[PDB]
């Protein structure tokens, strides 16, 4: 079952005395006329932000609550109990029965089975309300005990709840339960939200009445005036603001295809020891289209996934290219050993680009053997990352400098691959392209294809036109820019037209319907009905009597054909009255 609170769950926000003073507060309250669960006699509930909790009986079936996140061991929880003696607050790590309770001989307490690591102890019909909240490691408890003249139904009325306890625990809470005394020989749960209330203080300092300032237009007016009686008139109470849904973002097509099509499709690559190195500049490089050219044999990157490179941007891209064996592709990797990855190429350990490699046995190898690819094997030291050595000096191995004539312990530094088409993979020619990116300080270079969503119209939207960020309704235009102008401005300098980069059409930008909200009341001493004016808003975009005026959209009043003396002035010749009531 569910039930309706009426005006319930008001607590004194803090100490500090006070008398007749319609004082205004912002806090966590139980909104007026709320949807409170009903329980009879129970299960694990949430907490999520404070709790209202009433209960009704003459016996005592409700014997405290249990709180926490897991209601077991492995994390801490609170336990608040009351046998026929008195209250027992306690904070340990427990092991709670999934259905914990206490009996009524009169032997009881099948509640838990563990009391480890206790960090806090304490020991020592009817309507009993409680408000539980938990802020900054303090667990606050307000309470009130009113006598009903019923037995177990939620009554109506006003009664403010006075603070009881304060516990500096530190405990996290996400769930709570209840405890009941069995048979061996009715309760509600509200939740609290951040509201703003207007409390009326007595001359002794007690809260006697309140106003929830977000219930209806009358209450928002009472809050705006800081009173409990509004006299006839018309009052500005707040503001409206048509919210914008979605948000398009469309840039221009792609010009500089960014020519990978000759670094991957060149007729003749470089050898490895004098490896090629291209530098790419300002272009539109689509990495996913490069990814599925559908012939590769290694596509591996370390700094970044390839598909999420389609929405970054860099300053400079280096693309090295060469040709090596089959069994040496494992050397083109960060932190390797072996000739290649130590003689004709070295990667740094914090690499970021993609290594790409594929087979080209049918193109670079030939019967008799293509011997035109040279690789270095002799060097007096290792190499830096991205170093390059194109010299051809005669290396001396031994102690004897031999001076330009080879023989024992001095050799030529370069050998040649013999690429024969009757070879197994492991001596076959593989072509290798290594990318690397850098972001030094440069203004703008190669970026990706900024996903340009579809352009919508006639809806308050959040838009971006290749840099122009804004909000508003977009509409087909009938102005004519000059064919180099992107957007138009008004006097007082606000963007009011744009040109769509892709289709090149002019679109006006009008703001989102906004304005004030006014409440028309005959006075609370006459009635509590209300009418509402949305000022200069078209009455079709507001969220009976909906009536359109030159002054806005009026809701809650009927339009008649008579004409009286003016009572409450709306505007543009229109007045309102409480006559025909309504």
């Amino acid at each position: 079952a569910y039930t309706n609170s009426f005006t319930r769950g008001v607590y004194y926000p803090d100490k500090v005395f006070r008398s007749s003073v319609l004082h205004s507060t912002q806090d966590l309250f139980l909104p007026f006329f709320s949807n409170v669960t009903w329980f009879h006699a129970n299960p694990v509930l949430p907490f999520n932000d404070g709790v209202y909790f009433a209960s009704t009986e003459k016996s005592n079936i409700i014997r405290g609550w249990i709180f926490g996140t897991t209601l077991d061991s492995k994390t801490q929880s609170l336990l608040i109990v009351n046998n026929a003696t008195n209250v027992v607050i306690k904070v340990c790590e427990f092991q709670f029965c999934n259905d914990p309770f206490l009996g009524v001989m009169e032997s009881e307490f099948r509640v838990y089975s563990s009391a480890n690591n206790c960090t806090f102890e304490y020991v020592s019909k009817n309507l009993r309300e409680f408000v539980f909240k938990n802020i900054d490691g303090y667990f606050k408890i307000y309470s009130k005990h009113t006598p009903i003249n019923l037995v177990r139904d939620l009554p109506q009325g006003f009664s403010a709840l006075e603070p009881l306890v304060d516990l500096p625990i530190g405990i996290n809470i996400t769930r709570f339960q209840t405890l009941l005394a069995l048979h061996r020989s009715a309760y509600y749960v509200g939740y609290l939200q951040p509201r703003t209330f207007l409390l009326k203080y007595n001359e002794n300092g007690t809260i006697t009445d309140a106003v929830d300032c977000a219930l209806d237009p009358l209450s928002e007016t009472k809050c705006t005036l800081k009173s409990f009686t509004v006299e006839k008139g018309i009052y500005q109470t707040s503001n409206f603001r048509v919210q914008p849904t979605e948000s398009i973002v469309r840039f221009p097509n792609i010009t500089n295809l960014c020519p990978f099509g000759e670094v991957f499709n060149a007729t003749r690559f470089a050898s490895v020891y004098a490896w090629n190195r291209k530098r790419i500049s300002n272009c539109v490089a689509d990495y996913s289209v490069l990814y599925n050219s559908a012939s590769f044999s290694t596509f591996k990157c370390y700094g970044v996934s390839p598909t999420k490179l389609n929405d970054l941007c860099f300053t400079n891209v280096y693309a090295d290219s060469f040709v090596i064996r089959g069994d040496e592709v494992r050397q083109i990797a960060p932190g390797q050993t072996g000739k290649i990855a130590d003689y004709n190429y070295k990667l740094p350990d914090d690499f970021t680009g993609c290594v790409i490699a594929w087979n080209s046995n049918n193109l670079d190898s030939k019967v008799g053997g293509n011997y035109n690819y040279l690789y270095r094997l002799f060097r007096k030291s290792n190499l830096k990352p991205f170093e390059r050595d194109i010299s051809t000096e005669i290396y001396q191995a031994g102690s004897t400098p031999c001076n330009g004539v080879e023989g024992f312990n001095c050799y030529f530094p370069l050998q040649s691959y013999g690429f024969q088409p009757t070879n197994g993979v492991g001596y076959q020619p593989y072509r290798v392209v290594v990318l690397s990116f850098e972001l030094l300080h440069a203004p703008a270079t190669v970026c990706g294809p900024k996903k340009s969503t579809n352009l919508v119209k006639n809806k308050c939207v959040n838009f971006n036109f290749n840099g122009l960020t804004g909000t508003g309704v977009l509409t087909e235009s009938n102005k004519k820019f000059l064919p180099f102008q992107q957007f138009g401005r008004d006097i007082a300098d606000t963007t009011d037209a744009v040109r769509d980069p892709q289709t090149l059409e002019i679109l006006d930008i009008t703001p989102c319907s906004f304005g004030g909200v006014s409440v028309i009341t005959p006075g609370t001493n006459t009635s509590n009905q209300v009418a509402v004016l949305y000022q200069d808003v078209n009455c079709t975009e507001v969220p009976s009597n909906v009536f359109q005026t030159r002054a806005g959209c009026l809701i809650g009043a009927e339009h008649v054909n008579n004409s009286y003396e003016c009572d409450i002035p709306i505007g543009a010749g229109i007045c309102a009255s409480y006559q025909t009531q309504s």
Partner: antibody
Framework: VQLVESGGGVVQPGGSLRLSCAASGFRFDDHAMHWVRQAPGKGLEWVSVISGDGGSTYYADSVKGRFSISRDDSKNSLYLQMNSLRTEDTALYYC????????????????????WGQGTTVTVSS | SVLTQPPSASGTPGQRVTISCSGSSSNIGSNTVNWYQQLPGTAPKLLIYSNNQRPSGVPDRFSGSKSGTSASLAISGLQSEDEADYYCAAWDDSLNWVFGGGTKLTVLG
């Protein structure tokens, strides 16, 4: 272009086995090899791979340290030596050929497993 | 390293049926998928390697898609001989080949 296996049977838990797989129709220095087991009625489960051109092997984590795998291109064969079995190894074992060798670790983007054997049943118990 | 995929799919014979797989970042992120068909009793066949490339002998009813971190087989028009298990594979930088959970077919004829 064929793959046969041999070596299964019944051993008690604690024993050892030697599975073998013989291939025909291609060279072994152009392809990597896989041992893939499958419990009866259930899905597949990769066990081990050896690359072509010598050795760079990998095992699945639940079978780490217990097993060993080698190849022999003088005889065109695979050997999978199994030591200290447990009762969760009752399965068919398949000898699969991986086109384009090099552990899937280095030669990414194109590995596959094109041709398969007929499998060999092995079960354990007392 | 789990490669979650549905356990069984369905469809009338003669229309397109998709089969999905979802791996995280070491599975489908930086690697490629394969698809394997297992008719009941036989050895498994290869269907798709390198995310969309059927080898010789696979008919033109099977395709393949890889989008970011998901993959998808797409059988275009079922028939009386495609009632089998289908597995997706990956490599997982974790240093271990991973397999799918399999998916039966239920021509429902």
């Amino acid at each position: 272009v064929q793959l046969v296996e041999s070596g299964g049977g019944v051993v008690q838990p604690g024993g050892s086995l030697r599975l073998s797989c013989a291939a025909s129709g291609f060279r072994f220095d152009d392809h990597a090899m896989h041992w893939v087991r499958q419990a009866p009625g259930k899905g597949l489960e990769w066990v081990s791979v050896i690359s072509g051109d010598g050795g760079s092997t990998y095992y699945a984590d639940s079978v780490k340290g217990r097993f060993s795998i080698s190849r022999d291109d003088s005889k065109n064969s695979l050997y999978l030596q199994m030591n200290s079995l447990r009762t969760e190894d009752t399965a068919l074992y398949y000898c699969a050929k991986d086109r384009s060798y090099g552990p899937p670790d280095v030669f990414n983007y194109e590995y596959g497993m094109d041709v398969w054997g007929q499998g060999t049943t092995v079960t354990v118990s007392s | 390293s789990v490669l979650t995929q549905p356990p069984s799919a369905s469809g009338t014979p003669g229309q397109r049926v998709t089969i999905s797989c979802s791996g995280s970042s070491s599975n489908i992120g930086s690697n490629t998928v394969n698809w394997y068909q297992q008719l009941p009793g036989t050895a498994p066949k290869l269907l798709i390697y390198s995310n969309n490339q059927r080898p010789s002998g696979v008919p033109d009813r099977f395709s393949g898609s890889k989008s970011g971190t998901s993959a998808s087989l797409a059988i275009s028009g079922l028939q009386s001989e495609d009632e089998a298990d289908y597995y997706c594979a990956a490599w997982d930088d974790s240093l271990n080949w991973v397999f799918g959970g399999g998916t039966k077919l239920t021509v429902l004829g």
